[PDB]
Amino acid sequence: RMPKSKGATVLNLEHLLEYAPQQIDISNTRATQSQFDTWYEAVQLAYDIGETEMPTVMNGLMVWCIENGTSPNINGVWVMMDGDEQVEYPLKPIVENAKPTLRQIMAHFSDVAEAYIEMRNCKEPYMPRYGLVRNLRDGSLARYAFDFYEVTSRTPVRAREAHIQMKA
Amino acid sequence: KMRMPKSKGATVLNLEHLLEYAPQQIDISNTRATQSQFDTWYEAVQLAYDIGETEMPTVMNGLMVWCIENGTSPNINGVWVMMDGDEQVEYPLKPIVENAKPTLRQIMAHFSDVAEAYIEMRNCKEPYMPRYGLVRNLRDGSLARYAFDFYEVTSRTPVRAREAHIQMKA
Amino acid sequence: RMPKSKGATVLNLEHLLEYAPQQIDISNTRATQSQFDTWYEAVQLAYDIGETEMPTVMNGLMVWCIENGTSPNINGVWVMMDGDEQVEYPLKPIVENAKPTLRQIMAHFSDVAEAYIEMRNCKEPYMPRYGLVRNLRDGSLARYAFDFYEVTSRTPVRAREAHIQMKA
Amino acid sequence: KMRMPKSKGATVLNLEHLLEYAPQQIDISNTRATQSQFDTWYEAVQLAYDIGETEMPTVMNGLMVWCIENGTSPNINGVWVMMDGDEQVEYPLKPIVENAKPTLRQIMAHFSDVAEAYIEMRNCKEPYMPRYGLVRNLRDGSLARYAFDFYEVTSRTPVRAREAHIQMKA
Amino acid sequence: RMPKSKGATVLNLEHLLEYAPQQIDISNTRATQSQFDTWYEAVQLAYDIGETEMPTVMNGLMVWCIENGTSPNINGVWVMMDGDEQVEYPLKPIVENAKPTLRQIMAHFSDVAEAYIEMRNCKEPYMPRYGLVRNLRDGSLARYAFDFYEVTSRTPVRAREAHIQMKA
C-alpha cells in the first residue's frame, strides 16, 4: 500500500531504489557538515591559528577527547603535549561553537579515533580512560572505548554491548 | 438469543451492510492519520519548502529514510538532511512537525509498508539495522524491517516483530 | 429471616419467584434504554442524518470502536470507509451525549460486536486492535477483544480472563 | 468475504429476521408430524371411536402407554388394549394407523416428552424397561426412558441414549 | 508445451494470468445464477408472495433444509414457525423448479447457513439434525453439518472429514 494523496504516490520508487545514504550521513548521532564547518571555522578563529597548524591542534583534541570525554568543563582547558612540554588551550570555542553537542561535532572523528586507539595498541597495550573509568577489562574492545563513537550497522555486537555497559 | 441494539423498537444497525462492511484495519485505525490529515500536511510542506508538485516525491524519499534512521519525534527547530549524491541537503523540520496532526508518527505511518520494503532491499546488499534498533539493542537481523518508529502493528505483522516492538518501546 | 418492618415483610416472594431480569438489563455496565435513545436521537440530529442511513453510520461506528476503543479524543474524528473512500465524522455528539460513558452506551453492541468480530474471522484471521495492542496472541479469543464487551454469566472463563489481562 | 445469496442484486434473505429466527428443532423437524397432521389424526380417531371431546384424553393415555410397550408399527387389522382398572378394553387400530400421516411414529413423536416422563415415574416404583428394550437387549436401566419407538433424538438428548438407539435400531 | 492448432496457441496467457474465478462460481456443486433466479422467481410466483416477504420465507426454508436436508418428499410440506404458530408451505415449487438439484440450488446458502449454524451456537449449544442423525459428536463441527455445504479450498480438513463421515 503505497502512500498517496489525490491519486498519485507521494514517493518516487525509481529514485528510492537507488537512494542509499550511509547511516552516518543521515543519522543525528553526528553533526551535519554545515555544523562541522561552522565549529571548525570558529575554533580556528578563536585560537589565532591558520590552516598550516590547525590540523595539528585537532590531532591533540581528538586524543584528548578519547581520554577525557566529550562533556568537559566549559570554563576549563584541554591539554596537548608538544613533546615533553605541555600546551594548554581554552575549551570555550570548543564547546560554545559545537552545535548541537560536542559529541555530535566529535563524532566525525569516530573512524580516525578508532584507528588511533588501535594504532597505539600495536606495540604496547593502550586503553582510553573512558574504559578504564567505566570498568572495561577487555583490550580487544579498546578500539570502541570513547564517548563519540558512532554505532552503525557495521559495529560488532560485542562492541555494541561494551558501550551500553560503559554508558551505565 | 442475541439482543440486537434497538432505540424504539427498530434495530439501530443495518445488517445488510454490516455483513458486507469489512474495513481494512489500517483505514479506520488511529495509529494512522486520516487521508484528509495527510493531504493537509503534504500540501503544507509543499508550501513551506516552495518545492513544486514535481520533485516533492524525492523530498518525501529523504524524509522517509531520514525518519527510519532518526525517529518521528525530532526537534521542531532542527533540520533533517537528505543526500543529493555525495553532498548534504538540509531542510527545516518546522513544516514537517507543525503541520503533522495528530503527530508525525501517525502521519508517517502512511509509509510503513514502503519503509519495511526499503529496509529489505537495503539489507539485500549489506547489513542495515535502522538506528532505531541499534540504540535499542535490536540484535536479530531478520527483524530489521520493523525497526522504525512509525510502524503499524496490524493483523498481518509477525508475532515476533510485535514482541520486538514491545522491547524497543521502553 | 425475611426482612420486615412492623410485622409485615417488605418483599413479595410471589413476585420474586418469577422476577428474573437478565443481567445486562439491570447491570450498570451498560447504559439504560432511555439513555441509549437520548444518545441515538442526539447523534442523529447532530449528524444531519435521518433514519434512512443512520443505521449504516452506526455500522461504521461500532466497527471503529472495536478497533480503536471507547475512550477517544472528544476533539477528534472517527473514520468510516465508503468503499475505498474515507468518510470522516465528528466525535463531539458521540462522546458529549453518551451518558454516563460511551462504553455504557456502546455496551448495547456487545452481542453484535461479538458477531462481527467472529463474522470477519471466518474466511480470514481477524483481530481487533484492542487485542493487538494489549498483547493477545490467541485468535479463539478475538471475539471478546473490544472495550465495550459485556461480561455476563455466559462469558467463557477463558474470555473473562483475557479481559483482565488486556485491561492491565 | 461471505457471498450472501442474491437473485438480481438483492439478497434473498432477511437478515433482521434470520438473527431473531431460532426455531426449536422439534417444531420444524421431520421426525415429528405437523400439528396440522396431528389435529387431522386426533379428530379422525374421535370420529371412528365415537368417543366424545371428553374421555379422549384417557383413550390417548392407553395408546401412549400401549405404543411404548408394543411399538408404533402395529398391524392395521389388530386391536390395542388399555386397562380399565382390572379388565381389558380393546380398541381397533384402523383409525390409529389409517389416519396417521406420514406414519404413526411421527404422529406419536408428539408424546415423546411425556413418554420418557411416564417411564421414570413407572421406574420410580419398580423396574420398568419398555418391551421395546427387552426384545432388543437394552440392559442398562437408567437409559429406560429412551426405550420407545417414537422417541425424538434432539440436541438435548444424552449422547448415550443416542448411541443406545443406534443399538436398538437393528 | 502449450496447446496449439496450426501454429498458434489456443490459449491466451495474458488473460489467464489474471483469470481467477472463485471455485464456488465455476464449480458444479452449486447451481448457476441463471438457474437460481429461475428457481427463485418460480417459487415466488407459486407461493403468491411478493418481494416484501419472500426473503422472510427463504429464512425459514434455509433453516429447514439445515435441519431436514435437501432430498425431501416432493409431495410434502416444509414447516416455518411464526412465533409459536406453525406455517406450512408446499414443496412442489421448491423441488420441481430447483434445477439441477435442490442441493445445488441451496448451495447458495452455504455461507449463510454456516453463519446461522454458528450464530445459534453462541449462547446455547445447537446441532443440526443432519449431524444428530449421522452420528456426529463434536460441536466444533456443527457449522459444517448440513447437506448443501460447499466444500472449497478454505474448508478445514477436519470439516472436510466430517462430511465424508456423515455422507457414509
Author numbering:
A (entry chain Ak), C (entry chain Aa), E (entry chain Ae): 55 to 222
B (entry chain Ab), D (entry chain Af): 53 to 222
Quote what the paper states about this structure.
Potyviral CP plays a role in virtually every step of the viral infection cycle, from transmission of the virion by aphids, virus assembly and disassembly, regulation of genome amplification, protein translation, to cell-to-cell and long-distance movement.
To better understand what drives the orthogonal assembly of the trCP-derivatives, we analyzed the interactions in the locally refined 3D reconstruction of the trCPK176C cubes of 3.2 Å resolution. This revealed that the hydrophobic interactions between the P-sides of the ring pairs on the C2 symmetry axis are crucial for stable assembly. No disulfide bond was observed between the rings, because the C176 residues in the adjacent rings are too far apart. M54 in N-IDR is crucial for maintaining the interactions, as replacement by Cys in trCPM54C+K176C resulted in the formation of H2H double rings instead of cubes.
